[model samples]
Target: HAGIFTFEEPVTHVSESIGIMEVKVLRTSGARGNVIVPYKTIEGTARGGGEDFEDTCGELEFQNDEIVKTISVKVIDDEEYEKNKTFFLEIGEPRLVEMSEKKGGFTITEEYDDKQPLTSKEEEERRIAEMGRPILGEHTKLEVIIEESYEFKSTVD
Candidate 1:
């Protein structure tokens, strides 16, 4: 079986400096049997130094009932502005499947923002942005009108 597996998302973003980045490993074919994904961090703020953040070097096991797996990458918050911190996850020695790709990576950025009142321009921009999307929310109202009672006469004796 040419059941290749890799990360569903190669890269991700985090708004806060101290936040979690979610990444997923997915399978092309569920017939890939059980898989064990081994990885190592090649670069980042947490290289040899393991204090600022956690490192992922252990193996992940995906059982038969699984097609998607989620892994977390953590980054620390800082006051001083700096370049985006990144980590490289090398996908090597994958078991129970052929390696379609060699590697995948994760990134943590500091773009967090607090709630701010939207200006007229901003509000218009936001409204325009949502025009293409299907409307959804709690306030999305739907009214249904139907007769409450209907008499059905069935003559069967």
Candidate 2:
């Protein structure tokens, strides 16, 4: 079968302070064969220096090789505050022409989670109780039953 390739995590999340840009691999059909996928990068939100692509390392061996092809984009991180950045990862070739439009994106973002700690619904309910608030169904149980009744009929002339 022909090779079907894709990224493990197309939109990867990496730390802003991290210097190296994470490169992704092509997810193939898992067939046994060697496939060369040409790659490149499109300038977008990224603000730094890195090769657009690497042809020498573009040769990808499908089931013939590692779990997947690994490529890297060397980048530099700075102190300036940047909300996030993005760059498109492009791949091309004859066998992969159908997938020519296929591209993965690398996004750099802050590695901090400043949001409030997560709490389960049950936990939230407990908190509500601790605050001396009443829960809608607290100590409330509903029950219903039907009782049989005797019926008699007498013939009339």
Candidate 3:
């Protein structure tokens, strides 16, 4: 899967997100689907440059020009060799889109043992809570989850 971040105006800076900005995809793989919602961009707080919308903010001091486009985008699809059914990243941040077969954090417990259930639940919750923690669970697979995936109609702009 690939993500094509959209911008009606120029985005010179992207600090992060407080709320979510929905990104509407034009198509998926050009094989079976026409649209998909793969990622999101949520930053540290509920204010500031935390939402998914942005404008020019001088020359981004921490950005690399070769990786991200600072102006409006023409296409929002994945490049060749990066095709798939579905994927996601920051819901609003198109730059955070992830596409790969790489293994992520997950609990494969069959849950046959009752005692493990309690431990598993506690473990999973703790993992899920590691999103913005100052310490612990830092950058581990347990930090994210692919809750669901599907396909639907798409509109080409």
Candidate 4:
């Protein structure tokens, strides 16, 4: 029988300077004989031409009893400020496997320069400016819990 194939995750994110992005493909239901999986990159906001990322296409071979495979793509870094960009990866039809989902999306986070320290007055001014904005929920605060260990002692008189 044939095995079911799909991406491990629907969406992935990485920084621009990371240089490479890796995506995982999963096989389940059955681990039969050898199988081939083909894939390619599709351009969205991030185009491929050594500008945003390198256009890549190849076939992956799943040997006997193999259940997971990985595909890697080269991400180009320009070292400039820009909006977050997106791209897509798609899997082609394989001979002996069933595909669950054909495409996956990727996002490249924008890079920013280091900022200088701000004065207390400047910080207060920024905070005051944001206070007038509308909020979606009635309760805007979030509660966080920290767990720690402590010792307690009591003396009887």
Instruction: Identify the candidate with maximal TM-score.
Output: 4
Candidate 4 clashing pairs?
none
Q: Once superposed on the true structure, which residue ranges of model 2 sit more than 4 Å away at CA?
A: 23-26, 48-63, 79-83, 94-157
Tens digits of per-residue lDDT, candidate 3, 73-156, equal: 111222233322121222221121122223555758634332211123456664332321111111111111111123222211
Scored against the true structure, residue 40 in model 4 reaches a CA lDDT of 74
TM-score of each: 0.49, 0.44, 0.18, 0.55
Query: The CA-based lDDT of model 1 is what?
Result: 0.44
Error at 78, model 2, angstroms: 4.0
Q: In candidate 2, which residue pairs clash?
A: 6-27
Locate the minimum summed-lDDT window of 10 residues in model 3: 136-145
Q: Where does model 4 exceed 4 Å of error?
A: 79-81, 97-157
Candidate 1: list runs displaced more than 4 Å. 44-48, 78-81, 97-157
Q: Write the candidate numbers in order of decreasing TM-score.
A: 4, 1, 2, 3
* Residues 1-157, model 4: lDDT tens digits: 2445677665666555566677776663555555565667776666577876776778777756676777777777643445556677766544433323324346365233112221235567533322321111122111111011122222111
Q: Model 2, 1-157: lDDT tens per residue?
A: 3445555555444444444455556455544444445555544555434332111224444445556665455444433554345555555431321222223346375333212221235666434322221111111111101011222222111
lDDT (tens digit, per residue) of candidate 1 on 33-138: 5656555655544332444345666766665677666666555443344444556655544444333332334536423321222223546754432332212112
Against the unseen true structure, what C-alpha lDDT does each candidate score? Answer: 0.44, 0.39, 0.23, 0.51
Candidate closer to the true structure by TM-score (higher is better), 1 or 4: 4
Angstrom error of the Cα, residue 84, model 4: value is: 1.2
Rank list by lDDT: 4, 1, 2, 3
lDDT for residue 16 in candidate 2, whole number 0-100: 41
